[PDB]
Symmetry: C5
Subunit: 124 residues, 5 copies
């Protein structure tokens, strides 16, 4: 399976966005975070962030930001791939999220979203 | 004829888009992939991808991504030029396809899209 | 708490924008500034600026400019994090402001904006 | 007069766009082409291209692409400045055009578009 | 006062735009120029331009171009800050003007625009 593509949430909408600058560990960083809803329902996995100079994948900051802004604007249905337990600074985690944003794919219907899905119920 | 312009599908619409970051073959990549429809017709050749650090043509990642995103927004008719059998990462190929996106042109009628047809 | 996130205003709207190039303190700079709406007044309050080559955070100039331009376009409610007493060029501070923009987050309701609170 | 500004078509609309990646003369290129209409009047001078690493002016690839995409979206009236007989790749010239795109200006009426005239 | 901010026109709209590539004084340049109106009337102070590799402030070419494009789209009321007597290529100044674009700020009423006044 595609490494780092095993945890996602499907058929959500990006309903909040944050962008900011922040000093961490002696490095000047940019970050953004997305907030999610599932139609009129609140979900448990509802926020995720990307940081330009930290994380498992530092590439693609601007392309990911522009993609997140696009879907916040359209309100379209998406699948968000994310990684747990990446941001470990507790004050950033409290303020924003611990999860790193990995990918954003579209859902053209209530039953199809683009991108890899887990093999089976146990992700063997 | 133009090398790598011999394989295309015309008058399709980009109806899905994926963008992500991913480690492939020991390298940090960005990729995007487009999903296609042709109205209500059943199509099998329906997904094409571009990767920033792999492929026959590594240039133009941002410009191709922004172009693909534009036509996803409009839903307009386009021609997709692509190359078969490029992606060798088995997990990536299974999730998307082996096809590399080469070019996107517009179609202004049922009978015309820009670019070569030979 | 997150350093530089202690001072903010919530559920505000950006009603004016400035972008320019300017020589300050012997350096060539770009800057932009946002003005915030107060009631029905035309004149903005609480202006905040970012400068490409000066400030506590020089990174993110283009992304912050594009974010500010976005919310000026939509008129949506946002929370703005900023730092007081940053710009020391007296002509610039008099013309625009002495505050430096740190972050912009959305407010999805009258009681919730993303980001940390005090 | 401004060199390379002597040949233009006025009050046209950009009604087609192409963007692709391509190996030409042994070098990796990006290119884009614009296709034109003139309302309902038949126009033969109807396609112009720009290439990132070839041409009389290599600068401004992304800005010219983004400008062309802008006018394709709006359908607004523009003047196109171009140079004939530029592209030496015969496969490219037959697929797209020989003409190099030099400038795009707007037209605010049927008689006025910005820029120099002959 | 802020150097280079003393000369401006207020409550204008950007009603034309030019973008092109051009060889000037032996250098390969990009430029753009803005055309203005003053509501229902013409204004004879016009055609302010920015050049990527010449001028008093060469930074911010892309951000100024994108900002100009934005106000051309919205038609919003703006103040333009500019510097007189900059461009010395006689063919360029005859086709456009000699004025270097310095800043664009918004106007929220018929009597207020952001930025300093004389
Ligand atoms: C996203 C992705 O699929 N990336 C994989 C890439 C791309 O498929 C490829 O670069 C596109 O052109 O392929 C990777 O594996 C290649 C690499 O191991 C080279 C090294 O020799 O071999 C390539 O296959 C060769 C083969 O070895 C030759 O003998 C002959 O058969 O031709 C083929 C041409 O493909 C591998 O594809 C890569 O690292 O480049 C792995 C990426 O994950
Ligand atoms: C370089 C320079 O002189 N800039 C001044 C400009 C120019 O003189 C003017 O734009 C050239 O046409 O004028 C500035 O003041 C004008 C501005 O406040 C506009 C706002 O709409 O009003 C102009 O007054 C109008 C007036 O309100 C009308 O009733 C009528 O009387 O005509 C005049 C002309 O339009 C003000 O002159 C400017 O900011 O544009 C001041 C600049 O310093
Ligand atoms: C677009 C344009 O007009 N470019 C001019 C350029 C600009 O006018 C100038 O750099 C902006 O400050 O001026 C050029 O020519 C001259 C210089 O060679 C010389 O150093 O000084 C001259 C004035 O006394 C004049 O500016 C230039 O910088 O090369 C010519 C160029 O086409
Ligand atoms: C736009 C502006 O005000 N720039 C001024 C900066 C900023 O105030 C600080 O860089 C903020 O951290 O301060 C200076 O003293 C400096 O650093 O040399 C002078 C300069 O003119």
């Amino acid at each position: 399976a595609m490494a780092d593509y095993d945890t996602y949430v499907s058929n959500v909408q990006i309903n909040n966005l944050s962008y900011g600058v922040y000093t961490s560990g002696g490095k000047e960083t940019q970050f953004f975070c997305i907030g999610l809803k599932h139609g009129s329902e609140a979900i448990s996995i509802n926020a995720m962030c990307k940081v330009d100079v930290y994380g498992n994948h530092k590439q693609g900051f601007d392309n990911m930001l522009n993609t997140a802004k696009y879907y916040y604007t359209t309100g379209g249905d998406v699948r968000i791939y994310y990684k747990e337990n990446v941001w470990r600074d507790p004050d950033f985690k409290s303020a924003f999220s611990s999860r790193e944003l990995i990918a954003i794919t579209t859902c053209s219907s209530s039953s199809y979203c683009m991108g890899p899905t887990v093999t089976n119920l146990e992700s063997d």
